Amino acid sequence: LADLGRKITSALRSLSNATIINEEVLNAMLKEVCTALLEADVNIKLVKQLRENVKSAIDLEEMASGLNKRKMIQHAVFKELVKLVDPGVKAWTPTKGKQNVIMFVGLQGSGKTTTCSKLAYYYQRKGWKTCLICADTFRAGAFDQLKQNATKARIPFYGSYTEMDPVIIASEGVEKFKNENFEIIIVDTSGRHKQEDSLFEEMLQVANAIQPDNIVYVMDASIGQACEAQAKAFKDKVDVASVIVTKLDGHAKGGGALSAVAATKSPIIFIGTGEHIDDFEPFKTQPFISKLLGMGDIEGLIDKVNELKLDDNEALIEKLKHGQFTLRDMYEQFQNIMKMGPFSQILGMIPGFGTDFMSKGNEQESMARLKKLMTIMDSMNDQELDSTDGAKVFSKQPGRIQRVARGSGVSTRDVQELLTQYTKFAQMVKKMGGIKGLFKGGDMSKNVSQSQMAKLNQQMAKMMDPRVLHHMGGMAGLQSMMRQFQQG
RNA sequence: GGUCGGAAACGGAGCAGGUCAAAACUCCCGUGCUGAUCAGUAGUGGGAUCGCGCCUGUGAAUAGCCUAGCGAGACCCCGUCUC
Numbered sequence: 001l002a003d004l005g006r007k008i009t010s011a012l013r014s015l016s017n018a019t020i021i022n023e024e025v026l027n028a029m030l031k032e033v034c035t036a037l038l039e040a041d042v043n044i045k046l047v048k049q050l051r052e053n054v055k056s057a058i059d060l061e062e063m064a065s066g067l068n069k070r071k072m073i074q075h076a077v078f079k080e081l082v083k084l085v086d087p088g089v090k091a092w093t094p095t096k097g098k099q100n101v102i103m104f105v106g107l108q109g110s111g112k113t114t115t116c117s118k119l120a121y122y123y124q125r126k127g128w129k130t131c132l133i134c135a136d137t138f139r140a141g142a143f144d145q146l147k148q149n150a151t152k153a154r155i156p157f158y159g160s161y162t163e164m165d166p167v168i169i170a171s172e173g174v175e176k177f178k179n180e181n182f183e184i185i186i187v188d189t190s191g192r193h194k195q196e197d198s199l200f201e202e203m204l205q206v207a208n209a210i211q212p213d214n215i216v217y218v219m220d221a222s223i224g225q226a227c228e229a230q231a232k233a234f235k236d237k238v239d240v241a242s243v244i245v246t247k248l249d250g251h252a253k254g255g256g257a258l259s260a261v262a263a264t265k266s267p268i269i270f271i272g273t274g275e276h277i278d279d280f281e282p283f284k285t286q287p288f289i290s291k292l293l294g295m296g297d298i299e300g301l302i303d304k305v306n307e308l309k310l311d312d313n314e315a316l317i318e319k320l321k322h323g324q325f326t327l328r329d330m331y332e333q334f335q336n337i338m339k340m341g342p343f344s345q346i347l348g349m350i351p352g353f354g355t356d357f358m359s360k361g362n363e364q365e366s367m368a369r370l371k372k373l374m375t376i377m378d379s380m381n382d383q384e385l386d387s388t389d390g391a392k393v394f395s396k397q398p399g400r401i402q403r404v405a406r407g408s409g410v411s412t413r414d415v416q417e418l419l420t421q422y423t424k425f426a427q428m429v430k431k432m433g434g435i436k437g438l439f440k441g442g443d444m445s446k447n448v449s450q451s452q453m454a455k456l457n458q459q460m461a462k463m464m465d466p467r468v469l470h471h472m473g474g475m476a477g478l479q480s481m482m483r484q485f486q487q488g
Numbered sequence: 489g490g491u492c493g494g495a496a497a498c499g500g501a502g503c504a505g506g507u508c509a510a511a512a513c514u515c516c517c518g519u520g521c522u523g524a525u526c527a528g529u530a531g532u533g534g535g536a537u538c539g540c541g542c543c544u545g546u547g548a549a550u551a552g553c554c555u556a557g558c559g560a561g562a563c564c565c566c567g568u569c570u571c
């Protein structure tokens with residue numbers, strides 16, 4: 001949401017930074033935590049329940065004086081939110097080497113067609129073999145939309161323009177794809193409302209014909225009070241075990257999702273805040289709440305870095321210490337940046353300034369602009385990529401700039417800008433190599449001295465940018481965050 | 489890949505990497521010329537030729553040998569004289 005967390009985060013800061021904390025401060029700070037929940041479309045009775053749940057969870061009346069009050073008061077509300085969002089039932093996860101079939105249900109316009117592509121692309125990126133099934137025969141041009149999205153996501157799909165019965169086409173698609181031993185088979189179902197009994201029974205017919213391993217209900221975040229009535233009715237007929245929340249960018253912020261969880265006792269697997277297929281984020285329970293309290297996930301980021309799994313770390317270190325920074329290494333670093341995933345999630349997980357800093361309006365196309373860097377650098381040959389310094393060689397023969405511009409677009413100014421960026425990065429790497437022993441390997445210098453670390457910190461603080469270093473936390477804050485990444 | 493045209497299909501130039509019966513350069517074997525390095529390769533022209541096997545005659549010559557004597561002297565004996 002990136003907005004409720006700020007309000008809730010400011011409520012916890014109001015409770016803290018006070019010469020004293022009595023029974024009046026708690027209530028005062030609890031009012032700010034209630035108003036924020038009310039703005040999140042949550043029922044007033046549930047809010048009055050969380051307020052009473054945290055009141056009994058932290059009694060200052062007979063609280064053993066001498067124990068951290070704030071620490072156990074901020075943790076009392078963190079457990080409340082987590083509980084408020086955790087159903088308590090373990091989710092379903094497909095097994096390797098077995099055909100797992102997932103059936104999607106939801107209302108019209110919920111985004112099931114896009115959800116199929118998002119889930120399929122996520123599993124394909126993770127390494128799963130997946131295929132698409134289009135069992136929509138009521139929405140006009142639904143198969144065309146699914147086909148174009150699938151060929152955009154290079155994911156196999158099945159369907160037919162002329163077939164009108166969704167049961168037969170879905171069953172035959174599953175039967176066809178089970179022959180070639182496909183692991184994940186997701187079937188796209190047309191929109192449906194509980195008021196219409198014909199499609200209501202068609203849903204049971206397709207469910208019995210396919211027998212999905214798990215049923216996923218797609219719920220938009222912009223709907224209001226009408227969510228519970230349809231969700232309970234849908235669960236009463238089919239075995240819904242998980243749900244996916246879409247349109248997180250909406251103003252309604254999915255306030256009915258908490259009541260849906262309290263009703264169905266099922267968790268949300270993923271959330272999507274963008275129309276684009278690549279916008280797909282997990283809904284891990286503990287990290288989501290930890291983000292709301294300025295306690296960003298550290299395990300998730302290190303897990304992502306481990307997924308990056310750099311092949312070697314010794315030859316790179318000795319290259320850096322000698323002050324060599326080539327173009328091919330820069331291209332590999334950019335490739336790792338692209339493979340790192342969405343850019344917003346990288347800095348969202350840090351305990352730093354906040355998660356509502358990466359705006360979708362401009363940085364989404366800024367990533368595509370950065371994509372042009374590899375296009376420009378792909379015109380470089382092996383001699384240029386492996387050269388010790390590209391600026392020196394590029395300053396001797398201008399015709400190589402023309403050759404590079406041949407493969408790429410104009411690039412007359414773009415090549416010069418890329419060379420300036422490479423020169424700045426090369427000087428940064430030269431200084432990092434001149435720090436004289438801040439890297440692993442070689443000698444057994446496991447512990448780093450404070451003097452060399454101070455010199456490196458001074459060098460780092462002088463070249464990043466203004467207005468972001470001051471809010472980072474200063475030298476002490478930056479070093480503490482780096483230590484957090486070390487231990488975490 | 490990117491880029492340009494084209495609603496699309498598709499088409500043009502062309503970079504990164506790779507390929508050669510058809511840009512150019514160069515190497516090897518062979519061919520022609522030119523040098524230098526050369527000895528368990530011949531061939532007479534000399535030098536040299538106490539030893540070496542060498543093809544050889546016409547001749548009567550070549551090799552091997554050649555103490556003692558004389559004149560004077562102490563004591564003794566033999567003859568003569570004196571007291």
Ligand SMILES: Nc1nc2c(ncn2[C@@H]2O[C@H](COP(=O)(O)OP(=O)(O)O)[C@@H](O)[C@H]2O)c(=O)[nH]1
Nearest residue numbers: 107108109110111112113191247272273274275
């Ligand atoms: N804002 C936002 N819109 C979304 C998201 N996912 C899907 N949509 C919208 O959902 C529409 C597609 O819905 P559709 O798949 O046809 O729903 P269905 O007819 O029930 O299958 C698209 O026009 C998107 O604009 C999301 O994460 N954020």
